[PDB]
Each structure stands twice: as structure tokens, then as C-alpha cells.
Amino acid sequence: INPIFEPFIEAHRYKVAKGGRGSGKSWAIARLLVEAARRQPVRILCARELQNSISDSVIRLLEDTIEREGYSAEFEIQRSMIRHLGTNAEFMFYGIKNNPTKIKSLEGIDICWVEEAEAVTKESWDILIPTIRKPFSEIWVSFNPKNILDDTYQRFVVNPPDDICLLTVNYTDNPHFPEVLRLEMEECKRRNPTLYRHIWLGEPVSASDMAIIKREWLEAATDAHKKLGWKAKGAVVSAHDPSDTGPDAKGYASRHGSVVKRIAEGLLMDINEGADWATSLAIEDGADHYLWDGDGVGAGLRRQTTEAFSGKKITATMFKGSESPFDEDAPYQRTIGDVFRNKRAQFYYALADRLYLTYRAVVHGEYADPDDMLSFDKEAIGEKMLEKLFAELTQIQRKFNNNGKLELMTKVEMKQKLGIPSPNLADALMMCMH
Numbered sequence: 001i002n003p004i005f006e007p008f009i010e011a012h013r014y015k016v017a018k019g020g021r022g023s024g025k026s027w028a029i030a031r032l033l034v035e036a037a038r039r040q041p042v043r044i045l046c047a048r049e050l051q052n053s054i055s056d057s058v059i060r061l062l063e064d065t066i067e068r069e070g071y072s073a074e075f076e077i078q079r080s081m082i083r084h085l086g087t088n089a090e091f092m093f094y095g096i097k098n099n100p101t102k103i104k105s106l107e108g109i110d111i112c113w114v115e116e117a118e119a120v121t122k123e124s125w126d127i128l129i130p131t132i133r134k135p136f137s138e139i140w141v142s143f144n145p146k147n148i149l150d151d152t153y154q155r156f157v158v159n160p161p162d163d164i165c166l167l168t169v170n171y172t173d174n175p176h177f178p179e180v181l182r183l184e185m186e187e188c189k190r191r192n193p194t195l196y197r198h199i200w201l202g203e204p205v206s207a208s209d210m211a212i213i214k215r216e217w218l219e220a221a222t223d224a225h226k227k228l229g230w231k232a233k234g235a236v237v238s239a240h241d242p243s244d245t246g247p248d249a250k251g252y253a254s255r256h257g258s259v260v261k262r263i264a265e266g267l268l269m270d271i272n273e274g275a276d277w278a279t280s281l282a283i284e285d286g287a288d289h290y291l292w293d294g295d296g297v298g299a300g301l302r303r304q305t306t307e308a309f310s311g312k313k314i315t316a317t318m319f320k321g322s323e324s325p326f327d328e329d330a331p332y333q334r335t336i337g338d339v340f341r342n343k344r345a346q347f348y349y350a351l352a353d354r355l356y357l358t359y360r361a362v363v364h365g366e367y368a369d370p371d372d373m374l375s376f377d378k379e380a381i382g383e384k385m386l387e388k389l390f391a392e393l394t395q396i397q398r399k400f401n402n403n404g405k406l407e408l409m410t411k412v413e414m415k416q417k418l419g420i421p422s423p424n425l426a427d428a429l430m431m432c433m434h
């Protein structure tokens, strides 16, 4: 048996293994679980978040282990069950989303193994954990970490329970590391160091220290006009971000007063189609104002935009983020110009203060004028889009400036350094602060 896992044979209420791909932690566990089964009448539940059929489950890998060691002649193998013929030990495999009624009813569970545990939401941990309540029962947990603010990572790494054996492992710890995987992993290290550290060295997605917007604010911000009770009041503003000539997706944002109402992504579109797209959406959303990025490829859109808005009262404006700050000589509320390097920084910061405010209002009770907060309308926007947006905002980053000014990493630099695509929803949403 693979020696790092030695602490698991001892008796802990919580046994957790976290790591990257190819760290041999599914194989090891299936091994230990099998060996335990040959020597004790243990009822072993194997639970996952989603199990739409039996093939999604860890049964195939227990059949493979069983055959690999040569134990085949000891076990009974059916469709949804494995049983040891001597000890009478039993494996069963359910999904926590599919059969919550069945999982509460189960009786006498000694060992529960959650696998692919990173997908397991909080509502499932709350349903499961009490059901494994026999004394000296253990709950075994394997997982690759995604975001640092997901429940599973919170529950065991951040705010651990009592009696936890926490093992960390990478491929750097796998004695039998297949070439099939060594290949995928070398390709990755070279093409995208940042995705590599996520995937293979199992480092979770966390807030950078240079980040201007906290995830928590965004959550707080969601439906914050429904939580504090105030309505969308103001002009409607729409923003289009034309992206580039690359694969990256076009952005459109839009709000009514302090409430954001549409976040749309524009796909498979050139500059003019993309132009026609956002232009119609701004008409559709009854925009009073409509801006767009002209810094790059968007510079020549001007004529096509004003022609689209002919007949309607809609101000169209080419926004340039690299230009000096709006009202740069005005004092800061030391001048504006002293404080921001360009309009791009100015308006991401407007956004963040707005967010931060709402967050203080929603979460600590502190008053703030609804004209100063920001609220995401979840029904309007639709949770898919909403999530894409939140993933992007939280990567917007501060970079050093030699004159003490506030300045952001440019989209090109984020793409180059973070290996992420261009944050065009964020950039579209940012432009709405004007």
C-alpha cells in the first residue's frame, strides 16, 4: 500500500484527502476500503452529489481493484452492490441529490466515502453528515479543490471539525505516475502555469491580494434591492465591449438606476455584427445612454452606432479607459487626477465602492443611500450569466504605479499572466458607472 496514506488506517471520525489530478488518491482509498472490507463486517456507503446512473459511481474502480489484487473469488458482484462472502461486508452507492429519502433511511453505516467531494454543496453535507451517526463511524472524503469559498473546502480545510486527519497530496507523491498523465501535465505546465497550479498542484482559486472586489460583496450585492427594500430609480445605461479579433466573447451590460438588469455575452460575432447586437439590446432595454470601448478595434464603430440610434433619444459615447480620469483637476471625494491613473481605474473603483457599500448595508446593518449602492437582479439577469460575471469581477487586479496612483492590470496583461480570457462582462459592467 502507498505509504503516505498510513494515517488513514488509524481511527478518525474525519479522514480527508485533498489534491490535484494524478495523485493516486482515488486508487489508494479504493485499495484501503477493499482491504478493510475483507476483515470487518463494515457497511460502506459510497455517496456522491450527482449519480444519474450506476456508471457515474466508484463501483467500476472497486471492481478493478478487486480484480487487480486477485481477490475476485471472495466478492459477490452485482449491478449496484459489492459484498464480501466471508465478512459479509457491504458496499452501496447512492447520489445525495437523487435519493435524499433513501440516504436518511439507511441504517448501520460504518464508513461513508464521499468522492469528487468538491462538487458536493452545503445542503448535501447537512443532509448526509447526520445520517452517518453510528458510533466510531468515519466519513472519508477525497477531492480536488476548486474555489476557496466553496463549502467542502470551508468545512475541512478552513474551519475543520474535531478529529480530522488531513492529507495533502500531488502527483509529486505518486510512485506509479502514468505517462498518459505525465504528458497532459507537462503540456499544461508550459501552456498555462496558472491553470497548472490549480489543476495539478491542487491550489484552490482564491482572492488575489491585488483584487479590488471581494466575492462576499458580490453575494451580498445580489438582490440587495430586495433585501433592503428599494426600487430601481434613475436613467438606464447600456455598455458594449467589442473585445478583439480573438475568440473572446463580446460583452453587454445594462442597468436601471442602482440595479443591474441585463448581462449578455455575444458569441461568434465580428465587430459590426457585435455592434448591431449590443445596439439592439440597448434599444430593447430602453437605454437612455449607451457607451462602448473604442480604445481598440472599437474606434471606428462611431458612425454605425449613431445611425442605429437614429430617431431615438440615446446618447452614444466612445469610452476610453486609458485616457486621463474624468474631471481630473477636481478635488478627490489632492485631486482626482492624483488618485487614479486613467478612466479605467476610476470606474472599476466607483464600482467597488458601490459594492462595498451595499455589502456594509446588507451585512452589517449600516445605512447608505440607494443611489450609492449596486444591486444585481437575479431573476432578470438569470443565474448562468450572473455566475460568469462574478467569476470575472474577482480577477480584476491592482498593479504597481510609480507615481502613487491607483492603476489596474490591463486585459491583455491579465490574459497573458492569469491565462484567463478577457473579462468583457466586467469591462462592460464597469463602463456603466459613467
Ligand SMILES: Nc1ncnc2c1ncn2[C@@H]1O[C@H](COP(=O)(O)OP(=O)(O)OP(=O)(O)O)[C@@H](O)[C@H]1O
Residues within 6 Å of the ligand: 002, 019, 020, 021, 022, 023, 024, 025, 026, 027, 028, 144, 174, 176, 177, 178
Ligand atoms: N498504488 C498504485 N499502484 C499503481 N498505480 C497507481 C497507484 N496509485 C495511483 N496509481 C496511478 O495513478 C493514477 C491516478 O490515480 P487516481 O485516479 O487515484 O488519482 P486521483 O487522485 O483520483 O485523480 P483524480 O482527481 O483525477 O480522480 C491512476 O490511474 C493509477 O494508474
